[PDB]
Amino acid sequence: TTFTELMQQLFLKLGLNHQVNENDVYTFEVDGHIQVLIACYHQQWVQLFSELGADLPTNDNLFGEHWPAHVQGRLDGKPILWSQQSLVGLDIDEMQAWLERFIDDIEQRK
Amino acid sequence: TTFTELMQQLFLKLGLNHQVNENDVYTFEVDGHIQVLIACYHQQWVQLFSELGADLPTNDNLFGEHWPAHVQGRLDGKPILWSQQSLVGLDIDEMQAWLERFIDDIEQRK
Ligand SMILES: [Pt+2]
Ligand SMILES: [Pt+2]
């Protein structure tokens, strides 16, 4: 199905409150300090995004730890974490696991 | 089809010589200075890998420039570039374009 269908089914299932902006980007907060953005690009890629605060900028950024990989980047000089995967074949179960996995990773870093 | 089917069809089409090792990793050289490794992990992910020499380690590593993204990492303190995408939905045409695109990117950096 489309990104929104997936997104809806996702939040409507996990009973989590969400926030969609004008550009069609979903946001969900973990506890009270973790914000995760989820957008779809070019009708194929699902992007995850979350800020890290003032984490250890020294990250080798190799693939292997996660599938897909969690990449640490520099935005506004400020540390961020992102993950991407194609929509094709993406089921609600994989979506949930990927998120949990990304959420988990965020905490361990912050 | 499987990774190998794809891989074969790829090299057998572009008329490029290749080299498969013991771990089932394909290698292809561009001109005489560019080596690209292609492996499949967990029967789902196709990984691209190539060394950069002594490039500018200062890379923000944001998504957006390419789909999928070309990530710059540190392996053995030495700069590398990688890209990953799921096998599902992956056709020989996308494979070729992704490679060309990765190859291109390597050159511009080295
Ligand atoms: Pt597009
Ligand atoms: Pt596996």
PDB file of N, CA and C in Angstrom, chain B residues 17-103:
ATOM      1  N   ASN B  17      34.586  -7.488 -17.040  1.00  0.00           N
ATOM      2  CA  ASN B  17      35.192  -8.668 -16.426  1.00  0.00           C
ATOM      3  C   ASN B  17      34.975  -8.549 -14.924  1.00  0.00           C
ATOM      4  N   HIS B  18      34.781  -9.678 -14.252  1.00  0.00           N
ATOM      5  CA  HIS B  18      34.552  -9.633 -12.816  1.00  0.00           C
ATOM      6  C   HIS B  18      35.347 -10.685 -12.056  1.00  0.00           C
ATOM      7  N   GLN B  19      35.297 -10.605 -10.730  1.00  0.00           N
ATOM      8  CA  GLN B  19      36.002 -11.551  -9.877  1.00  0.00           C
ATOM      9  C   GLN B  19      35.247 -11.887  -8.588  1.00  0.00           C
ATOM     10  N   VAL B  20      34.774 -13.130  -8.509  1.00  0.00           N
ATOM     11  CA  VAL B  20      34.038 -13.621  -7.348  1.00  0.00           C
ATOM     12  C   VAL B  20      35.004 -14.366  -6.448  1.00  0.00           C
ATOM     13  N   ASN B  21      35.022 -14.037  -5.163  1.00  0.00           N
ATOM     14  CA  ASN B  21      35.913 -14.721  -4.241  1.00  0.00           C
ATOM     15  C   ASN B  21      35.243 -15.942  -3.620  1.00  0.00           C
ATOM     16  N   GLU B  22      35.770 -16.371  -2.481  1.00  0.00           N
ATOM     17  CA  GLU B  22      35.248 -17.526  -1.764  1.00  0.00           C
ATOM     18  C   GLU B  22      33.935 -17.222  -1.036  1.00  0.00           C
ATOM     19  N   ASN B  23      33.809 -16.002  -0.509  1.00  0.00           N
ATOM     20  CA  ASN B  23      32.613 -15.602   0.231  1.00  0.00           C
ATOM     21  C   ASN B  23      31.447 -15.153  -0.649  1.00  0.00           C
ATOM     22  N   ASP B  24      31.596 -15.332  -1.961  1.00  0.00           N
ATOM     23  CA  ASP B  24      30.555 -14.969  -2.922  1.00  0.00           C
ATOM     24  C   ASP B  24      30.389 -13.448  -3.077  1.00  0.00           C
ATOM     25  N   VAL B  25      31.519 -12.757  -3.158  1.00  0.00           N
ATOM     26  CA  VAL B  25      31.550 -11.309  -3.328  1.00  0.00           C
ATOM     27  C   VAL B  25      32.104 -10.972  -4.701  1.00  0.00           C
ATOM     28  N   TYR B  26      31.332 -10.224  -5.479  1.00  0.00           N
ATOM     29  CA  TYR B  26      31.751  -9.826  -6.816  1.00  0.00           C
ATOM     30  C   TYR B  26      32.578  -8.553  -6.810  1.00  0.00           C
ATOM     31  N   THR B  27      33.584  -8.509  -7.670  1.00  0.00           N
ATOM     32  CA  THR B  27      34.441  -7.337  -7.772  1.00  0.00           C
ATOM     33  C   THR B  27      34.575  -6.917  -9.222  1.00  0.00           C
ATOM     34  N   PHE B  28      34.586  -5.614  -9.453  1.00  0.00           N
ATOM     35  CA  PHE B  28      34.749  -5.106 -10.799  1.00  0.00           C
ATOM     36  C   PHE B  28      35.543  -3.817 -10.712  1.00  0.00           C
ATOM     37  N   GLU B  29      36.530  -3.691 -11.590  1.00  0.00           N
ATOM     38  CA  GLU B  29      37.374  -2.508 -11.601  1.00  0.00           C
ATOM     39  C   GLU B  29      37.010  -1.538 -12.708  1.00  0.00           C
ATOM     40  N   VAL B  30      37.028  -0.258 -12.361  1.00  0.00           N
ATOM     41  CA  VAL B  30      36.706   0.803 -13.295  1.00  0.00           C
ATOM     42  C   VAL B  30      38.020   1.408 -13.744  1.00  0.00           C
ATOM     43  N   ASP B  31      38.287   1.330 -15.046  1.00  0.00           N
ATOM     44  CA  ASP B  31      39.524   1.863 -15.594  1.00  0.00           C
ATOM     45  C   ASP B  31      40.618   1.054 -14.915  1.00  0.00           C
ATOM     46  N   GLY B  32      41.522   1.722 -14.215  1.00  0.00           N
ATOM     47  CA  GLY B  32      42.575   0.984 -13.555  1.00  0.00           C
ATOM     48  C   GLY B  32      42.790   1.356 -12.106  1.00  0.00           C
ATOM     49  N   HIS B  33      41.963   2.252 -11.572  1.00  0.00           N
ATOM     50  CA  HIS B  33      42.128   2.674 -10.185  1.00  0.00           C
ATOM     51  C   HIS B  33      40.899   2.506  -9.298  1.00  0.00           C
ATOM     52  N   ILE B  34      39.786   2.035  -9.853  1.00  0.00           N
ATOM     53  CA  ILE B  34      38.579   1.888  -9.041  1.00  0.00           C
ATOM     54  C   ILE B  34      38.043   0.469  -8.878  1.00  0.00           C
ATOM     55  N   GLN B  35      38.032  -0.009  -7.639  1.00  0.00           N
ATOM     56  CA  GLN B  35      37.527  -1.341  -7.330  1.00  0.00           C
ATOM     57  C   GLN B  35      36.219  -1.246  -6.560  1.00  0.00           C
ATOM     58  N   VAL B  36      35.203  -1.948  -7.040  1.00  0.00           N
ATOM     59  CA  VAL B  36      33.916  -1.925  -6.363  1.00  0.00           C
ATOM     60  C   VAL B  36      33.516  -3.325  -5.943  1.00  0.00           C
ATOM     61  N   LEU B  37      33.165  -3.492  -4.673  1.00  0.00           N
ATOM     62  CA  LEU B  37      32.731  -4.795  -4.175  1.00  0.00           C
ATOM     63  C   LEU B  37      31.215  -4.812  -4.051  1.00  0.00           C
ATOM     64  N   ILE B  38      30.623  -5.951  -4.378  1.00  0.00           N
ATOM     65  CA  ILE B  38      29.184  -6.112  -4.326  1.00  0.00           C
ATOM     66  C   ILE B  38      28.856  -7.411  -3.615  1.00  0.00           C
ATOM     67  N   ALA B  39      28.216  -7.316  -2.456  1.00  0.00           N
ATOM     68  CA  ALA B  39      27.855  -8.528  -1.742  1.00  0.00           C
ATOM     69  C   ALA B  39      26.378  -8.487  -1.368  1.00  0.00           C
ATOM     70  N   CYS B  40      25.829  -9.644  -1.030  1.00  0.00           N
ATOM     71  CA  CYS B  40      24.447  -9.715  -0.623  1.00  0.00           C
ATOM     72  C   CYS B  40      24.439 -10.249   0.806  1.00  0.00           C
ATOM     73  N   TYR B  41      23.715  -9.574   1.692  1.00  0.00           N
ATOM     74  CA  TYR B  41      23.650 -10.000   3.077  1.00  0.00           C
ATOM     75  C   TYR B  41      22.264 -10.431   3.510  1.00  0.00           C
ATOM     76  N   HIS B  42      22.212 -11.487   4.320  1.00  0.00           N
ATOM     77  CA  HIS B  42      20.955 -12.011   4.840  1.00  0.00           C
ATOM     78  C   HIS B  42      19.907 -12.263   3.751  1.00  0.00           C
ATOM     79  N   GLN B  43      20.362 -12.575   2.541  1.00  0.00           N
ATOM     80  CA  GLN B  43      19.467 -12.850   1.414  1.00  0.00           C
ATOM     81  C   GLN B  43      18.536 -11.700   1.051  1.00  0.00           C
ATOM     82  N   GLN B  44      18.895 -10.483   1.443  1.00  0.00           N
ATOM     83  CA  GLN B  44      18.047  -9.338   1.145  1.00  0.00           C
ATOM     84  C   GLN B  44      18.772  -8.074   0.720  1.00  0.00           C
ATOM     85  N   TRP B  45      19.906  -7.800   1.340  1.00  0.00           N
ATOM     86  CA  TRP B  45      20.588  -6.564   1.035  1.00  0.00           C
ATOM     87  C   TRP B  45      21.796  -6.644   0.144  1.00  0.00           C
ATOM     88  N   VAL B  46      21.790  -5.788  -0.868  1.00  0.00           N
ATOM     89  CA  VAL B  46      22.897  -5.678  -1.807  1.00  0.00           C
ATOM     90  C   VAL B  46      23.741  -4.488  -1.345  1.00  0.00           C
ATOM     91  N   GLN B  47      24.995  -4.780  -1.024  1.00  0.00           N
ATOM     92  CA  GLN B  47      25.968  -3.810  -0.532  1.00  0.00           C
ATOM     93  C   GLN B  47      26.992  -3.455  -1.587  1.00  0.00           C
ATOM     94  N   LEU B  48      27.316  -2.171  -1.712  1.00  0.00           N
ATOM     95  CA  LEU B  48      28.355  -1.703  -2.641  1.00  0.00           C
ATOM     96  C   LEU B  48      29.462  -1.169  -1.744  1.00  0.00           C
ATOM     97  N   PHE B  49      30.712  -1.417  -2.120  1.00  0.00           N
ATOM     98  CA  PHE B  49      31.852  -0.968  -1.323  1.00  0.00           C
ATOM     99  C   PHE B  49      33.053  -0.592  -2.200  1.00  0.00           C
ATOM    100  N   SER B  50      33.696   0.524  -1.880  1.00  0.00           N
ATOM    101  CA  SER B  50      34.863   0.967  -2.629  1.00  0.00           C
ATOM    102  C   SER B  50      35.722   1.883  -1.772  1.00  0.00           C
ATOM    103  N   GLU B  51      37.037   1.757  -1.916  1.00  0.00           N
ATOM    104  CA  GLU B  51      37.958   2.572  -1.136  1.00  0.00           C
ATOM    105  C   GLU B  51      38.210   3.940  -1.762  1.00  0.00           C
ATOM    106  N   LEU B  52      38.417   4.941  -0.909  1.00  0.00           N
ATOM    107  CA  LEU B  52      38.622   6.316  -1.363  1.00  0.00           C
ATOM    108  C   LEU B  52      40.043   6.894  -1.335  1.00  0.00           C
ATOM    109  N   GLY B  53      41.003   6.168  -0.765  1.00  0.00           N
ATOM    110  CA  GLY B  53      42.364   6.683  -0.707  1.00  0.00           C
ATOM    111  C   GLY B  53      42.642   7.505   0.545  1.00  0.00           C
ATOM    112  N   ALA B  54      42.744   8.827   0.401  1.00  0.00           N
ATOM    113  CA  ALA B  54      42.994   9.721   1.534  1.00  0.00           C
ATOM    114  C   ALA B  54      42.159  10.981   1.338  1.00  0.00           C
ATOM    115  N   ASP B  55      40.873  10.756   1.090  1.00  0.00           N
ATOM    116  CA  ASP B  55      39.880  11.800   0.842  1.00  0.00           C
ATOM    117  C   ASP B  55      39.596  12.701   2.056  1.00  0.00           C
ATOM    118  N   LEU B  56      38.784  13.730   1.833  1.00  0.00           N
ATOM    119  CA  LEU B  56      38.384  14.681   2.868  1.00  0.00           C
ATOM    120  C   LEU B  56      37.431  14.001   3.865  1.00  0.00           C
ATOM    121  N   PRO B  57      37.956  13.563   5.018  1.00  0.00           N
ATOM    122  CA  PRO B  57      37.146  12.896   6.041  1.00  0.00           C
ATOM    123  C   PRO B  57      35.964  13.715   6.564  1.00  0.00           C
ATOM    124  N   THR B  58      35.903  14.988   6.189  1.00  0.00           N
ATOM    125  CA  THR B  58      34.824  15.858   6.643  1.00  0.00           C
ATOM    126  C   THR B  58      33.591  15.770   5.747  1.00  0.00           C
ATOM    127  N   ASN B  59      32.755  14.758   5.974  1.00  0.00           N
ATOM    128  CA  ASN B  59      31.530  14.580   5.182  1.00  0.00           C
ATOM    129  C   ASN B  59      30.309  14.542   6.100  1.00  0.00           C
ATOM    130  N   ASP B  60      29.347  15.424   5.849  1.00  0.00           N
ATOM    131  CA  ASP B  60      28.142  15.502   6.670  1.00  0.00           C
ATOM    132  C   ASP B  60      27.281  14.243   6.672  1.00  0.00           C
ATOM    133  N   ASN B  61      27.446  13.408   5.647  1.00  0.00           N
ATOM    134  CA  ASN B  61      26.685  12.165   5.503  1.00  0.00           C
ATOM    135  C   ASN B  61      25.171  12.292   5.688  1.00  0.00           C
ATOM    136  N   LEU B  62      24.553  13.125   4.855  1.00  0.00           N
ATOM    137  CA  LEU B  62      23.104  13.316   4.892  1.00  0.00           C
ATOM    138  C   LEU B  62      22.518  12.483   3.759  1.00  0.00           C
ATOM    139  N   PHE B  63      21.234  12.167   3.849  1.00  0.00           N
ATOM    140  CA  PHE B  63      20.567  11.415   2.795  1.00  0.00           C
ATOM    141  C   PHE B  63      20.070  12.501   1.853  1.00  0.00           C
ATOM    142  N   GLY B  64      19.594  12.129   0.665  1.00  0.00           N
ATOM    143  CA  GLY B  64      19.087  13.130  -0.253  1.00  0.00           C
ATOM    144  C   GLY B  64      19.812  13.294  -1.576  1.00  0.00           C
ATOM    145  N   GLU B  65      21.136  13.242  -1.559  1.00  0.00           N
ATOM    146  CA  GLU B  65      21.909  13.398  -2.788  1.00  0.00           C
ATOM    147  C   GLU B  65      21.660  12.219  -3.721  1.00  0.00           C
ATOM    148  N   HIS B  66      21.591  11.020  -3.147  1.00  0.00           N
ATOM    149  CA  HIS B  66      21.379   9.811  -3.947  1.00  0.00           C
ATOM    150  C   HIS B  66      20.374   8.855  -3.339  1.00  0.00           C
ATOM    151  N   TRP B  67      19.776   8.046  -4.189  1.00  0.00           N
ATOM    152  CA  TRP B  67      18.833   7.072  -3.697  1.00  0.00           C
ATOM    153  C   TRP B  67      19.136   5.702  -4.298  1.00  0.00           C
ATOM    154  N   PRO B  68      19.657   4.781  -3.471  1.00  0.00           N
ATOM    155  CA  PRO B  68      19.941   5.052  -2.053  1.00  0.00           C
ATOM    156  C   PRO B  68      21.167   5.953  -1.854  1.00  0.00           C
ATOM    157  N   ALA B  69      21.383   6.365  -0.606  1.00  0.00           N
ATOM    158  CA  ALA B  69      22.473   7.251  -0.212  1.00  0.00           C
ATOM    159  C   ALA B  69      23.883   6.638  -0.315  1.00  0.00           C
ATOM    160  N   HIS B  70      24.891   7.465  -0.599  1.00  0.00           N
ATOM    161  CA  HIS B  70      26.279   6.979  -0.642  1.00  0.00           C
ATOM    162  C   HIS B  70      26.845   7.455   0.693  1.00  0.00           C
ATOM    163  N   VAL B  71      27.194   6.518   1.570  1.00  0.00           N
ATOM    164  CA  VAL B  71      27.708   6.860   2.887  1.00  0.00           C
ATOM    165  C   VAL B  71      29.222   6.726   2.943  1.00  0.00           C
ATOM    166  N   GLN B  72      29.869   7.688   3.592  1.00  0.00           N
ATOM    167  CA  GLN B  72      31.314   7.650   3.712  1.00  0.00           C
ATOM    168  C   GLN B  72      31.645   7.198   5.111  1.00  0.00           C
ATOM    169  N   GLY B  73      32.421   6.127   5.207  1.00  0.00           N
ATOM    170  CA  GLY B  73      32.788   5.611   6.507  1.00  0.00           C
ATOM    171  C   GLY B  73      34.287   5.534   6.706  1.00  0.00           C
ATOM    172  N   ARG B  74      34.676   5.123   7.906  1.00  0.00           N
ATOM    173  CA  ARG B  74      36.077   4.977   8.256  1.00  0.00           C
ATOM    174  C   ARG B  74      36.360   3.517   8.569  1.00  0.00           C
ATOM    175  N   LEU B  75      37.169   2.882   7.731  1.00  0.00           N
ATOM    176  CA  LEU B  75      37.529   1.491   7.958  1.00  0.00           C
ATOM    177  C   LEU B  75      39.049   1.433   7.998  1.00  0.00           C
ATOM    178  N   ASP B  76      39.592   1.007   9.139  1.00  0.00           N
ATOM    179  CA  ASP B  76      41.041   0.927   9.315  1.00  0.00           C
ATOM    180  C   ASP B  76      41.508   2.376   9.271  1.00  0.00           C
ATOM    181  N   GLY B  77      40.653   3.275   9.747  1.00  0.00           N
ATOM    182  CA  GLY B  77      40.982   4.685   9.714  1.00  0.00           C
ATOM    183  C   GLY B  77      40.951   5.178   8.275  1.00  0.00           C
ATOM    184  N   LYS B  78      40.903   4.233   7.337  1.00  0.00           N
ATOM    185  CA  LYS B  78      40.875   4.556   5.914  1.00  0.00           C
ATOM    186  C   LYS B  78      39.464   4.735   5.365  1.00  0.00           C
ATOM    187  N   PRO B  79      39.238   5.850   4.652  1.00  0.00           N
ATOM    188  CA  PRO B  79      37.986   6.276   4.017  1.00  0.00           C
ATOM    189  C   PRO B  79      37.384   5.300   3.012  1.00  0.00           C
ATOM    190  N   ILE B  80      36.108   4.983   3.204  1.00  0.00           N
ATOM    191  CA  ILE B  80      35.413   4.100   2.278  1.00  0.00           C
ATOM    192  C   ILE B  80      34.041   4.680   1.932  1.00  0.00           C
ATOM    193  N   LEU B  81      33.448   4.160   0.857  1.00  0.00           N
ATOM    194  CA  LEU B  81      32.134   4.606   0.414  1.00  0.00           C
ATOM    195  C   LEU B  81      31.267   3.375   0.251  1.00  0.00           C
ATOM    196  N   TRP B  82      30.018   3.448   0.709  1.00  0.00           N
ATOM    197  CA  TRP B  82      29.118   2.315   0.557  1.00  0.00           C
ATOM    198  C   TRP B  82      27.681   2.743   0.315  1.00  0.00           C
ATOM    199  N   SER B  83      26.910   1.836  -0.258  1.00  0.00           N
ATOM    200  CA  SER B  83      25.521   2.081  -0.580  1.00  0.00           C
ATOM    201  C   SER B  83      24.799   0.744  -0.411  1.00  0.00           C
ATOM    202  N   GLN B  84      23.542   0.784   0.005  1.00  0.00           N
ATOM    203  CA  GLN B  84      22.824  -0.453   0.208  1.00  0.00           C
ATOM    204  C   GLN B  84      21.372  -0.294  -0.208  1.00  0.00           C
ATOM    205  N   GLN B  85      20.786  -1.397  -0.641  1.00  0.00           N
ATOM    206  CA  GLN B  85      19.416  -1.412  -1.110  1.00  0.00           C
ATOM    207  C   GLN B  85      18.949  -2.859  -0.991  1.00  0.00           C
ATOM    208  N   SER B  86      17.650  -3.056  -0.820  1.00  0.00           N
ATOM    209  CA  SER B  86      17.097  -4.396  -0.687  1.00  0.00           C
ATOM    210  C   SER B  86      17.068  -5.040  -2.058  1.00  0.00           C
ATOM    211  N   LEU B  87      17.109  -6.362  -2.079  1.00  0.00           N
ATOM    212  CA  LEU B  87      17.085  -7.141  -3.317  1.00  0.00           C
ATOM    213  C   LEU B  87      15.700  -7.069  -3.945  1.00  0.00           C
ATOM    214  N   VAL B  88      14.679  -7.143  -3.093  1.00  0.00           N
ATOM    215  CA  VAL B  88      13.290  -7.091  -3.531  1.00  0.00           C
ATOM    216  C   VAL B  88      13.004  -5.925  -4.470  1.00  0.00           C
ATOM    217  N   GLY B  89      12.502  -6.246  -5.658  1.00  0.00           N
ATOM    218  CA  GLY B  89      12.187  -5.223  -6.641  1.00  0.00           C
ATOM    219  C   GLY B  89      13.393  -4.756  -7.438  1.00  0.00           C
ATOM    220  N   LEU B  90      14.569  -5.263  -7.087  1.00  0.00           N
ATOM    221  CA  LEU B  90      15.796  -4.865  -7.767  1.00  0.00           C
ATOM    222  C   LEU B  90      15.944  -5.512  -9.147  1.00  0.00           C
ATOM    223  N   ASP B  91      15.889  -4.689 -10.196  1.00  0.00           N
ATOM    224  CA  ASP B  91      16.050  -5.175 -11.565  1.00  0.00           C
ATOM    225  C   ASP B  91      17.449  -4.852 -12.076  1.00  0.00           C
ATOM    226  N   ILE B  92      17.850  -5.519 -13.152  1.00  0.00           N
ATOM    227  CA  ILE B  92      19.173  -5.307 -13.723  1.00  0.00           C
ATOM    228  C   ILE B  92      19.402  -3.860 -14.133  1.00  0.00           C
ATOM    229  N   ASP B  93      18.335  -3.171 -14.532  1.00  0.00           N
ATOM    230  CA  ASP B  93      18.453  -1.780 -14.957  1.00  0.00           C
ATOM    231  C   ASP B  93      18.779  -0.860 -13.798  1.00  0.00           C
ATOM    232  N   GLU B  94      18.135  -1.094 -12.658  1.00  0.00           N
ATOM    233  CA  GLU B  94      18.379  -0.294 -11.472  1.00  0.00           C
ATOM    234  C   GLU B  94      19.785  -0.581 -10.973  1.00  0.00           C
ATOM    235  N   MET B  95      20.190  -1.845 -11.068  1.00  0.00           N
ATOM    236  CA  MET B  95      21.518  -2.267 -10.636  1.00  0.00           C
ATOM    237  C   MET B  95      22.598  -1.513 -11.404  1.00  0.00           C
ATOM    238  N   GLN B  96      22.430  -1.453 -12.719  1.00  0.00           N
ATOM    239  CA  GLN B  96      23.378  -0.780 -13.587  1.00  0.00           C
ATOM    240  C   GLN B  96      23.482   0.710 -13.264  1.00  0.00           C
ATOM    241  N   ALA B  97      22.325   1.356 -13.147  1.00  0.00           N
ATOM    242  CA  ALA B  97      22.247   2.778 -12.854  1.00  0.00           C
ATOM    243  C   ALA B  97      22.852   3.119 -11.491  1.00  0.00           C
ATOM    244  N   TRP B  98      22.539   2.298 -10.493  1.00  0.00           N
ATOM    245  CA  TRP B  98      23.052   2.468  -9.137  1.00  0.00           C
ATOM    246  C   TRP B  98      24.585   2.399  -9.201  1.00  0.00           C
ATOM    247  N   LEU B  99      25.112   1.359  -9.845  1.00  0.00           N
ATOM    248  CA  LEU B  99      26.560   1.207  -9.990  1.00  0.00           C
ATOM    249  C   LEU B  99      27.193   2.410 -10.678  1.00  0.00           C
ATOM    250  N   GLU B 100      26.691   2.740 -11.871  1.00  0.00           N
ATOM    251  CA  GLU B 100      27.227   3.876 -12.629  1.00  0.00           C
ATOM    252  C   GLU B 100      27.291   5.076 -11.705  1.00  0.00           C
ATOM    253  N   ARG B 101      26.186   5.274 -11.006  1.00  0.00           N
ATOM    254  CA  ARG B 101      26.010   6.368 -10.075  1.00  0.00           C
ATOM    255  C   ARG B 101      27.038   6.324  -8.942  1.00  0.00           C
ATOM    256  N   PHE B 102      27.317   5.127  -8.433  1.00  0.00           N
ATOM    257  CA  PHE B 102      28.280   4.952  -7.352  1.00  0.00           C
ATOM    258  C   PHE B 102      29.700   5.180  -7.914  1.00  0.00           C
ATOM    259  N   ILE B 103      29.949   4.618  -9.095  1.00  0.00           N
ATOM    260  CA  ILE B 103      31.226   4.746  -9.789  1.00  0.00           C
ATOM    261  C   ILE B 103      31.552   6.213  -9.994  1.00  0.00           C
TER     262      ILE B 103
END
